[PDB]
Scaffold this active site. Sequence first.
Site, PDB file in Angstrom:
ATOM      1  N   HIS A   1       0.828  -1.221   0.000  1.00 52.06           N
ATOM      2  CA  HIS A   1       0.000   0.000   0.000  1.00 52.06           C
ATOM      3  C   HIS A   1       0.856   1.262   0.000  1.00 52.06           C
ATOM      4  O   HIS A   1       0.452   2.292  -0.525  1.00 52.06           O
ATOM      5  CB  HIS A   1      -0.933   0.057   1.213  1.00 52.06           C
ATOM      6  CG  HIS A   1      -1.851  -1.118   1.332  1.00 52.06           C
ATOM      7  ND1 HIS A   1      -2.861  -1.365   0.426  1.00 52.06           N
ATOM      8  CD2 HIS A   1      -1.930  -2.094   2.265  1.00 52.06           C
ATOM      9  CE1 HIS A   1      -3.511  -2.458   0.786  1.00 52.06           C
ATOM     10  NE2 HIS A   1      -2.962  -2.927   1.892  1.00 52.06           N
TER      11      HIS A   1
ATOM     12  N   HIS B   1       5.413   6.989   6.732  1.00 47.90           N
ATOM     13  CA  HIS B   1       5.150   6.532   5.380  1.00 47.90           C
ATOM     14  C   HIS B   1       4.680   7.728   4.567  1.00 47.90           C
ATOM     15  O   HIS B   1       4.486   8.819   5.109  1.00 47.90           O
ATOM     16  CB  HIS B   1       4.091   5.435   5.360  1.00 47.90           C
ATOM     17  CG  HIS B   1       2.776   5.898   5.898  1.00 47.90           C
ATOM     18  ND1 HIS B   1       2.451   5.830   7.236  1.00 47.90           N
ATOM     19  CD2 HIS B   1       1.734   6.513   5.287  1.00 47.90           C
ATOM     20  CE1 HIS B   1       1.250   6.351   7.420  1.00 47.90           C
ATOM     21  NE2 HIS B   1       0.799   6.779   6.253  1.00 47.90           N
TER      22      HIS B   1
ATOM     23  N   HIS C   1       2.072   9.065   1.077  1.00 47.26           N
ATOM     24  CA  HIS C   1       1.091   8.871   0.017  1.00 47.26           C
ATOM     25  C   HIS C   1       1.494   9.767  -1.142  1.00 47.26           C
ATOM     26  O   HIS C   1       1.904  10.899  -0.908  1.00 47.26           O
ATOM     27  CB  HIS C   1      -0.318   9.236   0.488  1.00 47.26           C
ATOM     28  CG  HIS C   1      -0.722   8.549   1.755  1.00 47.26           C
ATOM     29  ND1 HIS C   1      -1.464   7.385   1.764  1.00 47.26           N
ATOM     30  CD2 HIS C   1      -0.462   8.843   3.051  1.00 47.26           C
ATOM     31  CE1 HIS C   1      -1.669   7.008   3.015  1.00 47.26           C
ATOM     32  NE2 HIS C   1      -1.052   7.860   3.814  1.00 47.26           N
TER      33      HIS C   1
ATOM     34  N   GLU D   1      -3.275  13.639   0.724  1.00 46.84           N
ATOM     35  CA  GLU D   1      -4.568  13.248   1.271  1.00 46.84           C
ATOM     36  C   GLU D   1      -5.312  14.473   1.788  1.00 46.84           C
ATOM     37  O   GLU D   1      -6.422  14.766   1.355  1.00 46.84           O
ATOM     38  CB  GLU D   1      -4.369  12.213   2.378  1.00 46.84           C
ATOM     39  CG  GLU D   1      -3.686  10.959   1.829  1.00 46.84           C
ATOM     40  CD  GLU D   1      -3.993   9.719   2.628  1.00 46.84           C
ATOM     41  OE1 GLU D   1      -3.710   9.718   3.843  1.00 46.84           O
ATOM     42  OE2 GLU D   1      -4.497   8.740   2.044  1.00 46.84           O
TER      43      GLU D   1
ATOM     44  N   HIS E   1       3.386  11.078   6.512  1.00 46.72           N
ATOM     45  CA  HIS E   1       2.724  10.846   7.792  1.00 46.72           C
ATOM     46  C   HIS E   1       3.678  10.213   8.780  1.00 46.72           C
ATOM     47  O   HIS E   1       4.163   9.102   8.545  1.00 46.72           O
ATOM     48  CB  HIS E   1       1.510   9.936   7.602  1.00 46.72           C
ATOM     49  CG  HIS E   1       0.397  10.582   6.845  1.00 46.72           C
ATOM     50  ND1 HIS E   1      -0.587   9.863   6.198  1.00 46.72           N
ATOM     51  CD2 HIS E   1       0.124  11.889   6.627  1.00 46.72           C
ATOM     52  CE1 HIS E   1      -1.428  10.705   5.621  1.00 46.72           C
ATOM     53  NE2 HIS E   1      -1.018  11.939   5.867  1.00 46.72           N
TER      54      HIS E   1
ATOM     55  N   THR F   1      -6.390   6.985   7.676  1.00 49.41           N
ATOM     56  CA  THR F   1      -6.871   7.197   6.316  1.00 49.41           C
ATOM     57  C   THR F   1      -6.838   5.931   5.472  1.00 49.41           C
ATOM     58  O   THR F   1      -7.189   5.979   4.299  1.00 49.41           O
ATOM     59  CB  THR F   1      -6.067   8.270   5.574  1.00 49.41           C
ATOM     60  OG1 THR F   1      -4.740   7.790   5.316  1.00 49.41           O
ATOM     61  CG2 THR F   1      -6.038   9.604   6.363  1.00 49.41           C
ATOM     62  N   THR F   2      -6.395   4.819   6.060  1.00 58.36           N
ATOM     63  CA  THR F   2      -6.542   3.489   5.445  1.00 58.36           C
ATOM     64  C   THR F   2      -7.428   2.641   6.327  1.00 58.36           C
ATOM     65  O   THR F   2      -7.533   2.893   7.524  1.00 58.36           O
ATOM     66  CB  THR F   2      -5.205   2.744   5.287  1.00 58.36           C
ATOM     67  OG1 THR F   2      -4.710   2.376   6.585  1.00 58.36           O
ATOM     68  CG2 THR F   2      -4.185   3.604   4.556  1.00 58.36           C
TER      69      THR F   2
HETATM   70  C1  LIG Z   1       1.770   1.667  12.765  1.00 65.31           C
HETATM   71  O1  LIG Z   1       1.205   1.624  11.507  1.00 65.31           O
HETATM   72  C2  LIG Z   1       0.216   2.518  11.180  1.00 65.31           C
HETATM   73  O2  LIG Z   1      -0.107   3.370  11.851  1.00 65.31           O
HETATM   74  C3  LIG Z   1      -0.507   2.284   9.883  1.00 65.31           C
HETATM   75  C4  LIG Z   1      -0.448   3.543   8.988  1.00 65.31           C
HETATM   76  C5  LIG Z   1      -1.449   4.113   9.180  1.00 65.31           C
HETATM   77  O3  LIG Z   1      -1.931   5.042   8.063  1.00 65.31           O
HETATM   78  S1  LIG Z   1      -2.330   6.673   8.233  1.00 65.31           S
HETATM   79  N1  LIG Z   1      -2.648   7.183   6.746  1.00 65.31           N
HETATM   80  O4  LIG Z   1      -3.725   6.608   8.804  1.00 65.31           O
HETATM   81  O5  LIG Z   1      -1.338   7.499   9.072  1.00 65.31           O
HETATM   82  C6  LIG Z   1      -2.510   2.881   9.361  1.00 65.31           C
HETATM   83  N2  LIG Z   1      -1.957   2.115  10.092  1.00 65.31           N
HETATM   84  S2  LIG Z   1      -2.482   0.825  10.344  1.00 65.31           S
HETATM   85  O6  LIG Z   1      -4.019   0.913  10.438  1.00 65.31           O
HETATM   86  O7  LIG Z   1      -1.777   0.237  11.580  1.00 65.31           O
HETATM   87  C7  LIG Z   1      -1.996  -0.401   9.066  1.00 65.31           C
HETATM   88  O8  LIG Z   1      -2.035   0.386   7.900  1.00 65.31           O
HETATM   89  C8  LIG Z   1      -2.401  -0.218   6.602  1.00 65.31           C
HETATM   90  C9  LIG Z   1      -2.003   0.396   5.424  1.00 65.31           C
HETATM   91  O9  LIG Z   1      -1.439   1.623   5.758  1.00 65.31           O
HETATM   92  C10 LIG Z   1      -0.398   2.070   4.961  1.00 65.31           C
HETATM   93  C11 LIG Z   1      -0.178   3.582   4.984  1.00 65.31           C
HETATM   94  O10 LIG Z   1       0.238   1.339   4.314  1.00 65.31           O
HETATM   95  C12 LIG Z   1      -2.691  -1.714   6.559  1.00 65.31           C
HETATM   96  O11 LIG Z   1      -1.920  -2.518   5.720  1.00 65.31           O
HETATM   97  C13 LIG Z   1      -3.117  -2.265   7.864  1.00 65.31           C
HETATM   98  O12 LIG Z   1      -3.141  -3.706   7.852  1.00 65.31           O
HETATM   99  C14 LIG Z   1      -2.958  -1.517   9.145  1.00 65.31           C
HETATM  100  O13 LIG Z   1      -2.726  -2.369  10.328  1.00 65.31           O
HETATM  101 ZN   LIG Z   2      -0.867   7.878   5.860  1.00 67.50          ZN
END
Ligand SMILES: COC(=O)[C@@H]1C[C@@H](OS(N)(=O)=O)CN1S(=O)(=O)[C@@H]1O[C@@H](COC(C)=O)[C@@H](O)[C@@H](O)[C@H]1O
Ligand SMILES: [Zn+2]
Length: 257
Positions: A61, A91, A93, A103, A116, A195-196
């Site tokens: 992703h 990470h 986007h 985003e 982020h 946001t995912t």
């Molecule tokens: C510690 O990991 C996290 O926080 C990730 C990223 C975070 O995204 S964001 N856009 O809201 O700041 C989401 N989580 S998460 O819900 O733990 C993590 O994210 C996903 C994808 O997110 C990305 C950006 O690749 C998924 O694969 C998922 O299985 C989730 O466990």
């Molecule tokens: Zn993000």
Amino acid sequence: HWGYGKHNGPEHWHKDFPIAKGERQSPVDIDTHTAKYDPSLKPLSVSYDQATSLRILNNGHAFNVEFDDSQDKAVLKGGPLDGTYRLIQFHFHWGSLDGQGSEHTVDKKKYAAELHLVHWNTKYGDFGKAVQQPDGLAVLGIFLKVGSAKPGLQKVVDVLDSIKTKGKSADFTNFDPRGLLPESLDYWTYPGSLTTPPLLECVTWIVLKEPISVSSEQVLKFRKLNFNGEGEPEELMVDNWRPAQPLKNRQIKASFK
Ligand SMILES: COC(=O)[C@@H]1C[C@@H](OS(N)(=O)=O)CN1S(=O)(=O)[C@@H]1O[C@@H](COC(C)=O)[C@@H](O)[C@@H](O)[C@H]1O
Ligand SMILES: [Zn+2]
């Protein structure tokens, strides 16, 4: 399941994750004229001097740089936050073209990408517990525009060849995330969500006003990544962003006049 394609993208997510249509979803458009200066906001504290990076992972992703969060080594405090939030990963986007990729938007303007930095509230003990709480996470969002290169980004860019496809990871120790910050820490803040999927409504969003500049060569290398795994048909990892969601009953606050 979920992704960013025509048949599994953001408009489909609500079927598996009904909270996609919830009351505090992210990202949002930041209307700069409607955001209100809040003098009650304390100064933002970004303490990354002891950050311990570990690994970089293509998870299908995005690519994720992971940190040791088993101690208070890199933390975010102050601003709208109560208590201490530990950096766990960052990470990006990004888009297929320079005119899209972020985003959050600013007066409907889309940036080429968005960084982020994800932090979790240490009073909840671990990340998995924190995402179940309304104040569990603090995500620092930083816009990217294309112009001059960002020197602190280059070590990230140069390792991407080694994690081209989903499931690949590489050692990524001794990376200093301070090299990814803009000069100013002026910010907007609002209560929102991941946001995912799972789109949990657990995030205090802190979005910096000042974008960082990255070079066309740097963002081009983002776009050479792959959504697919090795030995599968190539799908370029581009446009992995969720569009702006309804603000509903929220006010965006500004740290600056
Ligand atoms: C510690 O990991 C996290 O926080 C990730 C990223 C975070 O995204 S964001 N856009 O809201 O700041 C989401 N989580 S998460 O819900 O733990 C993590 O994210 C996903 C994808 O997110 C990305 C950006 O690749 C998924 O694969 C998922 O299985 C989730 O466990
Ligand atoms: Zn993000």
